[PDB]
Design an enzyme around this catalytic site. Sequence first.
Site, PDB file in Angstrom:
ATOM      1  N   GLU A  81      50.662 -14.276 -56.249  1.00  0.00           N
ATOM      2  CA  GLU A  81      50.691 -14.743 -55.008  1.00  0.00           C
ATOM      3  C   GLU A  81      51.144 -13.743 -53.334  1.00  0.00           C
ATOM      4  O   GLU A  81      52.721 -14.392 -53.957  1.00  0.00           O
ATOM      5  CB  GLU A  81      50.299 -16.337 -54.872  1.00  0.00           C
ATOM      6  N   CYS A 138      51.225 -13.358 -49.609  1.00  0.00           N
ATOM      7  CA  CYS A 138      49.971 -13.221 -48.371  1.00  0.00           C
ATOM      8  C   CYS A 138      50.729 -13.197 -46.347  1.00  0.00           C
ATOM      9  O   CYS A 138      52.582 -13.547 -46.947  1.00  0.00           O
ATOM     10  CB  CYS A 138      50.010 -15.575 -47.932  1.00  0.00           C
ATOM     11  N   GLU A 143      53.528 -23.371 -57.541  1.00  0.00           N
ATOM     12  CA  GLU A 143      54.989 -24.061 -56.422  1.00  0.00           C
ATOM     13  C   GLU A 143      55.652 -25.028 -56.756  1.00  0.00           C
ATOM     14  O   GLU A 143      55.490 -26.030 -56.257  1.00  0.00           O
ATOM     15  CB  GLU A 143      54.294 -23.540 -55.160  1.00  0.00           C
ATOM     16  N   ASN A 162      57.877  -4.722 -55.551  1.00  0.00           N
ATOM     17  CA  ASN A 162      57.448  -5.183 -56.856  1.00  0.00           C
ATOM     18  C   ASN A 162      57.840  -4.484 -57.809  1.00  0.00           C
ATOM     19  O   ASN A 162      58.278  -4.114 -58.914  1.00  0.00           O
ATOM     20  CB  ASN A 162      56.274  -5.677 -56.769  1.00  0.00           C
TER      21      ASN A 162
END
Length: 498
Positions: free
Chosen positions: A340, A342, A235, A370
Amino acid sequence: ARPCIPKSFGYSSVVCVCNATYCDSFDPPTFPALGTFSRYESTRSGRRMELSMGPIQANHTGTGLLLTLQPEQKFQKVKGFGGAMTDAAALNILALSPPAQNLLLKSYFSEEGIGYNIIRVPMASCDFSIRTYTYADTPDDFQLHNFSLPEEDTKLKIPLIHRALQLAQRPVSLLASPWTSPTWLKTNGAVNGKGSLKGQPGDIYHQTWARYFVKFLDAYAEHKLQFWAVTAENEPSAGLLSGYPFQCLGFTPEHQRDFIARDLGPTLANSTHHNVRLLMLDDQRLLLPHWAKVVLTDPEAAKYVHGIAVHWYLDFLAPAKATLGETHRLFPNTMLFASEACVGSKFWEQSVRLGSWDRGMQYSHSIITNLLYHVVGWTDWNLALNPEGGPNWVRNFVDSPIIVDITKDTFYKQPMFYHLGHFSKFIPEGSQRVGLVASQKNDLDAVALMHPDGSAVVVVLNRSSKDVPLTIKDPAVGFLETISPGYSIHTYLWRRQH
Ligand SMILES: *[C@@H]1O[C@H](CO)[C@@H](O[C@@H]2O[C@H](CO)[C@@H](O[C@@H]3O[C@H](CO)[C@@H](O)[C@H](O)[C@H]3NC(C)=O)[C@H](O)[C@H]2NC(C)=O)[C@H](O)[C@H]1NC(C)=O
Ligand SMILES: *[C@@H]1O[C@H](CO)[C@@H](O)[C@H](O)[C@H]1NC(C)=O
Ligand SMILES: *[C@@H]1O[C@H](CO)[C@@H](O)[C@H](O)[C@H]1NC(C)=O
Ligand SMILES: c1ccc(CC2CCNCC2)cc1
Ligand SMILES: c1ccc(CC2CCNCC2)cc1
Ligand SMILES: [K+]
Ligand SMILES: [K+]
């Protein structure tokens, strides 16, 4: 092999309860008889990857929904599925008794579990840590003579990764990502807050930082662990933000471009780890396609970049076509990878919702989305958390597919676990996505892939309350007559005769 022991905590569905003497598990994987299909079904009503078989039929009549496999319409090859061995995950797993630890690791990494083949490994501390540290905290150590792995790696993460590898039959790929550099390399002299590397790409600070990646890979290699890929920074946009609460290191896309071109790419390429792939971005999708344009239109950076890593914050809305779609159109030879994901991160939502079917559907819907946008793999965040969604030194708690309750030496497998498993268990590395064409408009989400050995796998998610009768047609093989029940997810598998 052993069925789900269900428990309700008052959410829409159940968790499966595992402990030192019991966990749900599958039989060793076997394909259905030629002319037969396997169906694995999970439902809000409580079924958890239950196995049934049916006939593949020569004939089909009627005007019901037909999904026709397009086995020769080929899209991306799949790298795989997994999750992150954070300090928090490691601490939670190791707080269980040895037997429960084993059943948890088997749940994820064995073929009697869901067959994970990716582990993401933070390079030193992140928010899902209880201690803030880097591997080189001794100041002004530009040659990194005092680089070393602490016990978080040597006693917690590394032993657990070795145990996961021993349980797996599939080759497991490791992915490394740093959150912060040592503070003496940073403009703000702190692990968090707004701050970047000092100076400019090509100078001692940036060269030291690139060398830190090689020192990390060398150190893990001494423990007999090799990496498939690294990301250029977790990030990178976060460290550009005033007051950022936890470990970060800020890069603009131009800064990342030049760091990759001048320092990280050359340093990795000149090391014994030159086979390790480099992924850029490792951040949220609204940064695309802009970030890809900045980095990949510079040939000096582009020659070092193998792929683009994207984060999925499933609690938040963002466009997919204008981000992932456009990136694939502009840079079709640069793979996209989800590194990642979440849920539960909003401060006002319960971090851990034990038995949430909705959060399960968020996971599988995101995975399908995705895959339909050409992404080659999908990586969850923390492999396990406590019932608070931690530990986390800034209390940035979130949900996890496995929740550990040390006071009962128990762990709970969330709907999220099974929703991920409907993909991970049934889609080996090297599978290729293929087309799947609907005969009429419908409310289902679906994806089809072909295994390396030619076998077919189809995942069908129904986020509606209505049961949808449907037929899957494999033009070479015949017809699968089935139903997609309301609030269900199914995985279909069959052999394909020539
Ligand atoms: C790990 O979990 C196991 C699965 O829950 C526990 O084993 C179960 O223990 C129960 C209590 O002795 C057995 O009886 C059932 O208990 C449930 C309440 O949890 C009741 O609703 C049932 O009525 C009761 N059934 C009967 C016929 O009495 C379970 O049969 C048993 N299950 C299995 C699969 O063995 C373990 O005890 C637990 N291990 C540890 C170390 O805590
Ligand atoms: C399937 O299709 C044709 C329909 O004319 C028929 O000849 C054949 O016997 C049918 N088979 C079965 C098993 O119903
Ligand atoms: C490049 O590789 C050689 C070993 O082949 C090494 O000695 C040298 O230090 C490397 N250059 C760097 C790290 O700049
Ligand atoms: C039943 C369950 C899962 C599968 C797929 C796996 C993929 C990894 N190699 C073993 C087979 C086939 C049949
Ligand atoms: C639609 C959904 C599930 C199935 C399989 C059944 C579900 C009930 N237990 C026996 C196996 C068939 C069609
Ligand atoms: K050190
Ligand atoms: K929360």
